[PDB]
Design an enzyme around this catalytic site. Structure first.
Site, short mmCIF file in Angstrom:
data_model
loop_
_atom_site.label_atom_id
_atom_site.label_comp_id
_atom_site.label_asym_id
_atom_site.label_seq_id
_atom_site.Cartn_x
_atom_site.Cartn_y
_atom_site.Cartn_z
N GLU A 179 -0.21 6.31 11.36
CA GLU A 179 1.17 6.23 10.33
C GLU A 179 2.06 6.17 10.29
N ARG A 180 3.13 5.06 10.94
CA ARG A 180 4.59 4.83 11.20
C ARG A 180 5.17 6.82 10.65
N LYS A 195 0.35 -1.10 0.04
CA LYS A 195 0.10 0.05 -0.30
C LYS A 195 1.04 1.30 0.16
#
Lengths: 51, 469, 47, 53, 498
Positions: free
Chosen positions: B180-181, B154
């Site tokens: 997200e990270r 993704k």
């Protein structure tokens, strides 16, 4: 103390009569085990903190 | 107005007002914090109390702390001055570069466009990716989804799209990283600085970034999507121009909504989800639209928990998207990258009257041959390949060639594969697949087609394979 | 509860791996044969 | 040899189909048990959440 | 004689000061949760203390009472007791003074050995570093396992995940990583020294004692901290041990040093958090875990950063350990942590019993950093090894032609090459030597049951006769042309001579 003369092995295996390979392989293995042991032991016994 | 914290439970703060209450969705500022803690009103509980979700850590809050009522929802800075910057949910900058000096502040909560504003025109958006262009072609102004579990591609695919479309796109662009990270946020910041879309010297930046990464409390993750959406909406309307809007992932919005629902007093729904899942997602996905005043091309990455496409979150998200590209792990194990599933991806414009009869027929032929291959794989598990009808082996060979030919090397996946990125124009993809189906390559080996661009590159790779045979 | 096409390789049990290998070995063999033919054609078409 | 081989293949396929049928019966029973257990588990989770407010 | 003297030395220095402190009366105590009444100015997640010297955390701030969780046993707290607020968010000691010390979740020495001389305290609940401080992961974190250093490499600042079933060899990988750092920590340069932290959550005290003695035998406590919140420690301690250890590692990464932290397991921190949340009456979620169960871990694993050179340059690697049930990676906490972490290392029982140990499932194991954070020699060799195993795994389910027969032969040779023992991590150059010998068609002549014998004997031979070549490979960090020619002749000679 220790300075072991080097060896060639493919050369070494050329000089065993068929009647003598049964001892040559055993000697090779015993050399292997002893060399592994020597590598295992340290270069010196560790010091002692007497004070 | 001034109120007073009366309870703190997790991320949910109950604030009591002696004067008139503040309306729902208003932003309140806690007084006595070194940093800026903003609560957002979510409910009126009666007895002058209002429940709120904190947009920051609620550590060090004391029962009785005074609270100010801003009088308006969270208002973020908007304009051409936000380009090249980074922002929180509450709009303050987190790039350590100084204040964002705009004249316009936009509230992050707004009504969706009415039905009399919808554009009904669709034209293919050529992304340069073979599988996407062939089987699930995108569309300018349409909403794109990228489903798939964890570790399927993704983020790599979305970075690849930013590399292609955004770099050569005249209009502006927005990237809202939702839950997200943070490593990936920094990597993107530096990659964009290197490419040049973010220019730290001049005022020529073409990308505005908003970050709500996964270290933030649920309140901030549930709203950073709205902040990025507000920036994009302003660029759509006032600037009157094309916009791109990338989101990664839009499942963390739902999940963050689910982490506070139980504490707001709502009974859970099907699988530990809030009762308002569909409504909460709709009131957001309905502002990401191409009205007649502007045009937002929205690309969304959607985590699918445990590869389960029937989970309520992705299942509901499916209905809000024009095009979908369902990345599949079973195809990523095979080494076919991007792992887009050709049979589980769809597009609205995929009709013979929008793309053309050649494009449509090639796509449908590819899909049919792949489905026939799937049907045959069951038999091969018992007979073996040696026992198939000499026509079936032809179907299997074509299917494997087509399966490999959909793989492509990205310019952002150089580190993994070590290969070089290829951009394949649409006509070349159509020609390649039409030829592979027509049988003009039923002598080249399969591996010749693996990770190459246009078909001629497959021919050249086969030639090299033969020479060093 | 029904069954669908391409399910043996979706389970990924023993039959799935067995089928995958039965396919891969055969197509490696055919790729080798086709590469040999391609080399022969290359050499025969230089002149 | 070909006659005997075809007879043996018919017999082997019949036995394999019979074994697959027994395995299908057992797995269908297991699937029904698991489906009911999953329904009950999800419902009990919902009930506990509702009563724990 | 001097025993009593040193006893007195403790009394001589006492805490005379008695201050006017805010308090509260314990309305109700039961199951480890107290409901204090009072404490009108107590903060959220502040540390309070009870009349018996027992600590606790004020987790719930309700209008009528404060829900406090007791960091210890609960039988000693009565109704109508007194809770004094200490006026300080929960924090733990930090510093190099902790190295070699076993401490509990709150930073109290647990092995006797006196107290901790820490001069600084750090709050457990600190926000992760922003987006700007970090910098992409550059250096390699040398784990010592061939299959991890070659096929799923780990950088410094990465957050790998070791996920598997019970008794597949996860703690073994953690201990090998801890032990390997001895060679770097003994050396001189401080840019390679890596201080290790081991958080033991829910493990019985016997297991942690075995682990600590194992580290002591390998002389690996010079640089290891062990934060043990064992099974008999109240849930508020097993819930907080990961954060305490992560603060002890945040100190290192914030002071230009490098740290490695190993939460073991996180699937037990999740259970302790669930127990806490259910006993505070917070509504349950899916599988009874609270709603904030992803946050619990995401806020914890996001602190493993890689600071840029402006912020010291320090780093903090994390190796969380998860435990799945019968390989059901699709469970709740496993999926959360898989979507939180960078890489993964899948251990499988089917591989553990088939003889492949460590059971690392190289097919599924991933590492986003990949190329980066790998030495140039390993990058050169492990790439070809990765391709060879990738091809082998396709045609493996069976067991003709020369090409595919040799492909299977090479795959099997490499497979038996990757096996390893326990607590015997290898230097990176030694791994490169072994993998180079295996991947350059040399072992294809040998039987696959004898590959372990080769590997071992070859290592023993090279470590003594050709120490110079290994030093060259380490220092220059690549297989130069002359180094490659040497490696070639050494392997050719040794193979025949064996």
């Amino acid at each position: 103390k220790l300075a072991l003369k080097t060896i060639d092995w493919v050369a070494f295996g050329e000089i065993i009569p068929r009647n003598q390979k049964a001892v040559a392989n055993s000697l090779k293995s015993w050399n292997e085990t002893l060399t592994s042991r020597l590598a295992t032991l340290p270069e010196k016994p560790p010091a002692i903190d007497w004070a | 107005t001034t109120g007073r914290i009366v309870a703190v439970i997790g991320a949910v703060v109950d604030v009591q007002f002696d004067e008139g209450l503040p309306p729902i969705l208003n932003a309140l500022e806690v007084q006595g914090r070194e940093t800026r803690l903003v609560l957002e009103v979510a409910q009126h509980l009666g007895e002058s109390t209002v429940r709120t979700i904190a947009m920051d850590g609620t550590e060090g809050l004391v029962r009785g702390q005074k609270v100010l009522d801003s009088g308006a929802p969270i208002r973020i800075p908007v304009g051409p001055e936000t380009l090249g910057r980074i922002m929180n949910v509450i709009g303050e900058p987190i790039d350590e570069r100084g204040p964002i000096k705009t004249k316009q502040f936009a509230a992050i909560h707004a009504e969706a466009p009415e039905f009399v504003e919808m554009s009904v025109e669709q034209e293919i958006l050529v992304t340069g990716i073979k599988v996407v262009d062939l089987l699930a072609p995108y569309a300018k102004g349409g909403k794109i989804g990228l489903f798939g579990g964890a570790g399927v591609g993704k983020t790599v695919l979305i970075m690849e799209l930013i590399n292609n479309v955004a770099k050569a796109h005249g209009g502006y662009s927005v990237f809202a990283g939702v839950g997200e990270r943070t490593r990936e946020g920094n990597d993107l910041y530096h990659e964009m600085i290197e490419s040049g879309v973010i220019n730290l010297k001049d005022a020529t930046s073409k990308v505005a970034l908003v970050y709500g990464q996964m270290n933030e409390p649920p309140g901030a993750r549930a709203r950073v999507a709205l902040t990025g959406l507000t920036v994009a909406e302003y660029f759509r309307d006032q600037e009157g121009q094309d916009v791109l809007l990338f989101i990664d992932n839009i499942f963390r919005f739902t999940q963050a909504g689910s982490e506070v629902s139980a504490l707001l007093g709502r009974i859970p729904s099907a699988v530990g989800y809030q009762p308002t899942l569909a409504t909460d997602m709709g009131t957001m996905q309905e502002r990401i639209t191409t009205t007649k005043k502007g045009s937002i091309t929205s690309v969304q990455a959607i985590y699918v928990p445990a590869d389960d496409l029937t989970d309520p979150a992705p299942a509901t998200t499916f209905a809000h998207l024009d095009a979908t590209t369902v990345l599949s792990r079973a195809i990523a194990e095979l080494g076919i990258y991007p792992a887009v599933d050709p049979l589980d991806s769809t597009s609205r414009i995929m009709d013979p009257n929008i793309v053309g009869s050649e494009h449509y027929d090639v796509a449908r032929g590819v899909q049919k041959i792949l489905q026939d291959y799937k049907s045959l794989q069951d038999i091969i598990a018992i007979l073996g390949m040696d026992e198939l009808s000499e026509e079936d082996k032809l179907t299997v060979s074509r299917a494997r060639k087509i399966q490999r030919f959909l793989s492509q090397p990205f310019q952002v996946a150089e580190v993994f594969t070590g290969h070089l990125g290829k951009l394949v124009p649409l006509k070349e993809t159509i020609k390649g697949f039409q030829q592979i189906l027509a049988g003009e390559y039923d002598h080249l080996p399969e591996q010749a087609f693996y990770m190459v661009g246009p078909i001629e590159e497959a021919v050249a790779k086969a030639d090299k394979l033969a020479e060093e045979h | 509860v029904r069954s669908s096409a391409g399910a043996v390789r979706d389970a990924g049990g023993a039959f799935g791996k067995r089928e995958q290998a039965e396919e891969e070995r055969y197509f490696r063999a055919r790729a080798k044969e086709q590469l040999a033919a391609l080399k022969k054609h290359h050499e025969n078409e230089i002149s | 040899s070909t006659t005997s081989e075809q007879s043996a293949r018919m017999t082997a396929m019949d036995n394999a189909s019979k074994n697959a049928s027994e395995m299908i019966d057992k797995l269908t029973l297991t699937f029904n048990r698991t489906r009911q257990a999953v329904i009950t588990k999800e419902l009990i989770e919902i009930i506990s959440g509702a009563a724990a407010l | 004689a001097e025993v009593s003297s040193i006893l007195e030395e403790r009394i001589l220095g006492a805490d005379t000061s008695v201050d006017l402190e805010e308090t509260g009366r314990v309305l109700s105590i039961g199951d480890g949760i107290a409901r204090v009444h009072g404490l009108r100015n107590v903060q959220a997640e502040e540390m309070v203390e009870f009349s018996s010297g027992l600590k606790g955390m004020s987790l719930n701030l309700e209008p009528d009472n404060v829900g406090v969780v007791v960091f210890g046993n609960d039988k000693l707290i009565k109704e109508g007791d007194i809770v004094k607020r200490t006026g300080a968010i929960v924090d733990v000691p930090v510093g190099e003074e902790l190295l070699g010390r076993v401490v509990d979740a709150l930073g109290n020495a647990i092995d006797g050995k006196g107290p901790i001389g820490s001069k600084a305290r750090r709050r457990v609940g600190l926000k992760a570093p922003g987006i700007i401080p970090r910098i992409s992961v550059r250096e390699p974190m040398q784990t010592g396992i061939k299959a991890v250093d070659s096929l799923v490499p780990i950088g410094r600042g990465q957050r790998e995940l070791i996920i598997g079933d019970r008794q597949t060899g996860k703690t073994s990988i953690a201990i090998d990583t801890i032990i390997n750092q001895k060679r770097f920590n003994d050396g001189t340069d401080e840019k390679k020294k890596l201080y290790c932290i081991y958080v033991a959550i829910g493990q019985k005290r016997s297991t942690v004692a075995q682990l600590v003695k194992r580290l002591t035998d390998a002389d690996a406590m010079k640089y290891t901290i062990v934060v043990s919140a064992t099974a008999s420690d109240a849930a508020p301690l097993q819930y907080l041990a990961p954060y305490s250890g992560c603060s002890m590692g945040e100190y290192f990464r914030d002071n230009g040093k490098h740290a490695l932290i190993i939460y073991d397991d996180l699937s037990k921190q999740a259970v302790a958090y669930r127990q806490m949340s259910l006993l505070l009456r917070r509504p349950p979620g899916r599988e009874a875990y609270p709603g904030d169960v992803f946050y619990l871990h995401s806020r914890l694993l996001e602190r493993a950063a890689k600071m840029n050179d402006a912020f010291g340059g320090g780093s903090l690697t994390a190796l969380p350990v998860i435990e799945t049930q019968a390989g059901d990676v699709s469970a709740y906490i496993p999926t959360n942590v898989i979507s939180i972490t960078d890489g993964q290392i899948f251990l499988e029982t089917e591989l553990f019993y088939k003889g492949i140990r460590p059971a690392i499932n190289v097919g599924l194991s991933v590492s986003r950093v990949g190329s980066a954070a790998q030495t140039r020699a390993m990058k050169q060799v492990a790439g070809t090894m990765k391709l060879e195993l990738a091809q082998y795994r396709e045609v493996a389910a069976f067991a003709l032609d020369a090409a595919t027969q040799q492909l299977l032969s090479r795959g099997v040779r490499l497979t038996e090459l990757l096996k390893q023992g326990q607590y015997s991590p290898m230097a990176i150059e030694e791994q490169v030597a072994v993998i180079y010998a295996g991947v350059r068609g040399y072992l294809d002549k040998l039987e696959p049951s004898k590959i372990t014998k080769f590997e071992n004997a070859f290592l023993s031979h090279v470590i003594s006769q050709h120490q110079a070549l290994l030093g060259k490979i380490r220092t220059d960090g690549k297989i130069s042309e002359e180094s490659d020619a040497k490696l070639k002749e050494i392997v050719t000679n040794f193979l025949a001579g064996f």
